Amino acid sequence: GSYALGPYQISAPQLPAYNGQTVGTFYYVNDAGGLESKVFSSGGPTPYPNYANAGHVEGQSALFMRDNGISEGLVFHNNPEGTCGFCVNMTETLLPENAKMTVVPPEGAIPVKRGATGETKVFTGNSNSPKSP
Amino acid sequence: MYADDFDGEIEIDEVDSLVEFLSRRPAFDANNFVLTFEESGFPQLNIFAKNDIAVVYYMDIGENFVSKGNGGTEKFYENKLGGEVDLSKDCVVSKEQMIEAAKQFFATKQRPEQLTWSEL
Numbered sequence A: 001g002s003y004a005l006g007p008y009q010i011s012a013p014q015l016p017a018y019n020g021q022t023v024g025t026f027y028y029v030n031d032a033g034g035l036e037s038k039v040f041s042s043g044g045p046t047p048y049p050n051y052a053n054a055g056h057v058e059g060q061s062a063l064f065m066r067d068n069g070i071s072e073g074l075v076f077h078n079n080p081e082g083t084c085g086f087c088v089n090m091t092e093t094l095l096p097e098n099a100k101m102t103v104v105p106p107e108g109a110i111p112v113k114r115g116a117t118g119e120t121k122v123f124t125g126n127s128n129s130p131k132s133p
Numbered sequence B: 001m002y003a004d005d006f007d008g009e010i011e012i013d014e015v016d017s018l019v020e021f022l023s024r025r026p027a028f029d030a031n032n033f034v035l036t037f038e039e040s041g042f043p044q045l046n047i048f049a050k051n052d053i054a055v056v057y058y059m060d061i062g063e064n065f066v067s068k069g070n071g072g073t074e075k076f077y078e079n080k081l082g083g084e085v086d087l088s089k090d091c092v093v094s095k096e097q098m099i100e101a102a103k104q105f106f107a108t109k110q111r112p113e114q115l116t117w118s119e120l
């Protein structure tokens, strides 16, 4: 299971075993067309603590895209209960307009909270921006 | 009605069970509740609770709202193994105010009119 990210074909990197804090690798393409990655973990402070997902792996991925003018990104996280409902419903607001970001939970993720998803999701950013707290 | 917390999902049929359920604090003196009538989870009330305080979200397709209390951050827990989240102190509402909100959502299946809301 590899995923397209511009010209590159990327499959899941090895990740820590999940212990209650989500960990993930974000991949993106810089202005030169080169491949870059960042590691994010959940639980930190954030500039938008009013959004429950801002400090998540996928939320930091989204806010990094906003702050760096990135338009296409791919994130792998290790949470076995999938991508949460906060992220399903708020991630296009953090994303800058029209930016595309694909979130890949671990294989065989099984959600336990309604609204959460165990499937890969492709968010494309909408026009609204985070409100400041 | 579907009701999710740290320990999993049960179905709630009347308000008194709901009120008992929202009092559960299985770990870190905390809980994370998801109340929904839909199999897809939308609309939902999504509640973070710790000690006698809470933060309440209401979510629907194209709709995102958070409770408005009276500011730094306050740490809540998302799961039983201790995954943490930092939330706005501006959104922290009383544990009681949260019960009244959950009561209204149970009877109306729509955004509770009790709390003050900010739209996200």
Ligand SMILES: [Zn+2]
Residues within 6 Å of the ligand: A053, A056, A058, A083, A084, A085, A086, A087
């Ligand atoms: Zn999330």
